[PDB]
Amino acid sequence: TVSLTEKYKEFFKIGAAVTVKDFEGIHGRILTKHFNSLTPENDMKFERIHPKEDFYNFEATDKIKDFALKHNMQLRGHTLVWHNQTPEWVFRDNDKEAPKELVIERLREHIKTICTRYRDVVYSWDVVNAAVEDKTDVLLRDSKWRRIIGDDYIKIAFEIAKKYTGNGKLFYNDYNNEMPYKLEKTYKVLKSLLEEGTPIDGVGIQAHWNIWDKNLIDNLKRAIETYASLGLEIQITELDISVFEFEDRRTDLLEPTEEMVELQAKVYEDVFRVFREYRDVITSVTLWGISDRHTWKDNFPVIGRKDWPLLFDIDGKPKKAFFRIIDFL
Ligand SMILES: O[C@@H]1[C@@H](O)[C@H](O[C@@H]2CO[C@@H](O)[C@H](O)[C@H]2O)OC[C@H]1O
Q: Which domains does the chain have, with CATH numbers?
A: 1-329 (3.20.20.80)
Q: Is 173 helix (H, G, I), strand (E, B) or coil?
A: strand
* Residue 175 Cα: closest atom of ligand 1: 11
Closest residue by Cα to atom 13, ligand 1, is 129
DSSP per residue over 73-124, as a string?
Answer: -EEEEEEEEESSS--GGGGEETTEEPPHHHHHHHHHHHHHHHHHHHTTTEEE
Q: Can you say how many angstroms the Cα of residue 296 is from the centroid of all Cα atoms in its chain?
A: 13
Dihedral (Cα; 163, 167, 170, 176), 10-degree rounding? -160
Pairing, β 202-205 against β 233-242? parallel
Q: Is 18 helix (H, G, I), strand (E, B) or coil?
A: strand
DSSP 130: S
Check: CB of residue 173 under 8 Å from CB of residue 130.
yes
Q: How far is the CA of 173 from the centre of ligand 1 (A)?
A: 12
Closest residue by Cα to atom 4, ligand 1, is 296
Number of H helices, E strands in the chain: 11, 11
Of residues 41, 178, 233, 238, which has the active-site annotation? 238
Check: CB of residue 166 under 8 Å from CB of residue 119.
yes
Q: CA 36, CA 9: separation in Å to the nearest integer?
A: 9
Q: CA 133, CA 140: separation in Å to the nearest integer?
A: 5
Q: CA 38, CA 72: separation in Å to the nearest integer?
A: 11
Helices (H), 177-328: 180-195, 216-228, 258-277, 320-325
Residue 238 is among the residues annotated as catalytic for this protein: yes
Q: How far is the CA of 195 from the centre of ligand 1 (A)?
A: 30
Structural method: X-ray
DSSP 319: P
Q: How many CB atoms within 10 Å of residue 229?
A: 11
* Residue 289 Cα: closest atom of ligand 1: 4
Helices (H), 15-75: 25-34, 46-49, 59-70
Q: How far is the CA of 1 from the centre of ligand 1 (A)?
A: 31
Residue 130 Rama label (left phi>0; alpha psi -120 to 50; beta): left
Single-letter residue type at 9: K
Q: What are phi and psi of 80, to 5 degrees?
A: -80, -50
Q: Which residues contact 263 (CB under 8 A, 6 or more apart)?
A: 211, 212
Closest residue by Cα to atom 19, ligand 1, is 296
Q: Can you say how many angstroms the Cα of residue 56 is from the centroid of all Cα atoms in its chain?
A: 22
CA distances from 51 to 43, 54, 84, 129 (A): 11, 8, 13, 19
Q: How many CB atoms within 10 Å of residue 232?
A: 19
Single-letter residue type at 142: D
Q: CA 14, CA 167: separation in Å to the nearest integer?
A: 19
Q: How far is the CA of 180 from the centre of ligand 1 (A)?
A: 23
Pocket of ligand 1 (CB under 6 A): 41-42, 129-130, 175, 206, 238, 296
